[PDB]
Amino acid sequence: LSPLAKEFLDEIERIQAEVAKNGREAVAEKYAPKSLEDNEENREAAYRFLLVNFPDDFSEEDKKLLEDFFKWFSEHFPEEFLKDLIYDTAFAAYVEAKKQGDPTLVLPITLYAAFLAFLEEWKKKYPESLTPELKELIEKLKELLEEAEKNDPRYKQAQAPIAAAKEAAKKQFKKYTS
Ligand code: NA
């Protein structure tokens, strides 16, 4: 695991322990961005605010998929670009959810959808560089989002935050490959 990959799953568990003690409403309020200004502090806060909502329906298969994505990303890009991708997509989702009037729409699916969008841009740019590893990541992310569309009551309500995260992912991809 890259240093950023371990921090990710560990921070989820650290926050999950806070929720067990203090309740999710209090913990979400603790980690919510202080404003909508696009600065490093608020982007990092949006990332932690997203993590508050991660343990709910967080399977070992979902964890392994995240690990596989992190490994692939780190093989192709500097580590700092992964942090920026996660923070920028979490912030975009949060800002849009807040505008819609429900910050609880900052759901894990927003991050999975952003990772899928990033991979789809990579596939478009490097059509002669596809590998079984990439093809499997794309397939598994599509299947995860297909299962959420079928079984998560909030999928439709989260359309706008998901779209904002996907657009942020596309913008980061264009930055990382120019
Ligand atoms: Na699942």
Numbering used by the authors: 2 to 179
Paper text:
Here we use a robust deep learning pipeline to design complex folds and soluble analogues of integral membrane proteins. Unique membrane topologies, such as those from G-protein-coupled receptors, are not found in the soluble proteome, and we demonstrate that their structural features can be recapitulated in solution. Biophysical analyses demonstrate the high thermal stability of the designs, and experimental structures show remarkable design accuracy. The soluble analogues were functionalized with native structural motifs, as a proof of concept for bringing membrane protein functions to the soluble proteome, potentially enabling new approaches in drug discovery.
